Amino acid sequence: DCRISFGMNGAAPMIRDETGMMVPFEGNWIFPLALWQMNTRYFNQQFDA
Amino acid sequence: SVRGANPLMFRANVLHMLLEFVLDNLYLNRHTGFSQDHTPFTEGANLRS
Amino acid sequence: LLHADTPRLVTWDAGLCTSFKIVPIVPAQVPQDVLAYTFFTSSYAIQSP
Amino acid sequence: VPFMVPISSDHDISSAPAVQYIISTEYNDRSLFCTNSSSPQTIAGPDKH
Amino acid sequence: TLVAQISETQYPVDRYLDWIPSLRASAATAATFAEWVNTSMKTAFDLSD
């Protein structure tokens, strides 16, 4: 459950923690391969940049 | 009228309707076959085909 | 008396055991002026339940 | 000197990354007269009445 | 000895490659695996039956 929410009006987009916290696209994350596999297209689009 | 219906006949109709709702569902659920999930979306479950 | 039509008792169904279906009434608001299309799953050809 | 500046909007709009390289040392946007002059208010981006 | 290392069997064996990811083989999956473990042995010993 790593649902992502788009940033509105300038705010940064955010993904959901494992704890249930929405954090922004920066810092150090830990992804089990599976996650990417399940969302290859979406993640590639949202994160790459 | 073609767009109209007589209300005093409602119950009669509805009743018969339910009767067919049953008749049309009188089947035995047949078992087909499965295949293990080759992706990580599910923990290697057996998906029916 | 000598030979009455015999009812068809055993019948099989290999499909889904449901009689209700969810249908779309009014199409989604996509694309729109606020949420960028790159947000919606439908934009990535993801098949939804 | 080239500057890349955002288009002010008058309604909630999604958000997306932007990589910049040049900014000034002091205010220089005095040339700006008004944003969304025909709308009731500028919600995202530089607002100037 | 092998198959027991990709499925859940109660056969006592030292597992040295548990760090290499693997699903929990279903009968169907295990089977195809076996077929290779099978043919490989045959072609190695020049067996044709």
Side-chain angles (χ1 to χ4, degrees):
Chain A
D1 172 29
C2 50
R3 290 171 276 160
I4 296 177
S5 166
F6 271 37
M8 212 63 81
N9 303 352
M14 311 182 96
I15 184 172
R16 186 168 187 293
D17 216 322
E18 161 195 59
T19 52
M21 306 286 246
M22 300 302 281
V23 301
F25 293 23
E26 81 176 71
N28 305 308
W29 298 349
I30 292 181
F31 269 34
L33 179 57
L35 292 197
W36 203 285
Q37 290 181 76
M38 294 195 202
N39 300 294
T40 276
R41 300 309 168 207
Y42 210 70
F43 281 9
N44 249 303
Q45 169 62 43
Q46 309 311 298
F47 304 149
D48 281 36
Chain B
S1 174
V2 305
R3 307 182 163 301
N6 178 308
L8 296 165
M9 269 49 144
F10 282 166
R11 193 189 305 169
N13 278 276
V14 174
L15 272 168
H16 180 271
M17 180 173 103
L18 304 195
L19 170 56
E20 284 196 338
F21 180 89
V22 178
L23 291 182
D24 196 29
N25 266 294
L26 288 173
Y27 294 79
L28 286 185
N29 295 297
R30 192 168 190 70
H31 159 222
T32 45
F34 311 76
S35 41
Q36 178 159 53
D37 194 315
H38 274 42
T39 79
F41 284 80
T42 91
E43 285 199 300
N46 282 289
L47 289 42
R48 168 162 159 267
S49 166
Chain C
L1 274 191
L2 301 178
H3 21 63
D5 273 54
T6 59
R8 180 51 137 292
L9 286 182
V10 217
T11 43
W12 301 93
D13 175 23
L16 303 194
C17 185
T18 184
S19 295
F20 305 87
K21 64 195 277 202
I22 292 77
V23 303
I25 305 304
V26 177
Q29 301 176 296
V30 173
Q32 58 183 59
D33 285 4
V34 315
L35 241 325
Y37 82 99
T38 73
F39 163 87
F40 306 82
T41 77
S42 66
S43 290
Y44 303 81
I46 296 188
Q47 297 189 183
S48 171
Chain D
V1 180
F3 293 91
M4 164 184 267
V5 31
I7 297 180
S8 303
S9 158
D10 66 55
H11 63 260
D12 301 303
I13 62 178
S14 89
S15 181
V19 181
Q20 292 223 58
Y21 289 90
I22 299 176
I23 64 173
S24 58
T25 300
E26 46 185 284
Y27 192 63
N28 271 284
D29 231 18
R30 186 167 199 182
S31 189
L32 190 54
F33 190 86
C34 184
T35 56
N36 300 302
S37 57
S38 65
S39 302
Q41 82 286 71
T42 295
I43 293 190
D47 178 49
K48 173 67 174 182
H49 300 65
Chain E
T1 295
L2 264 38
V3 60
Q5 292 201 57
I6 62 176
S7 60
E8 285 181 298
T9 288
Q10 281 193 56
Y11 190 57
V13 302
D14 312 285
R15 331 197 67 189
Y16 295 141
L17 309 184
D18 266 33
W19 52 280
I20 292 180
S22 183
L23 51 67
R24 271 181 287 173
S26 81
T29 291
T32 80
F33 172 69
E35 177 57 24
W36 287 75
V37 175
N38 188 54
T39 64
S40 279
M41 294 209 60
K42 298 204 293 182
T43 70
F45 285 101
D46 214 26
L47 283 172
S48 58
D49 280 358

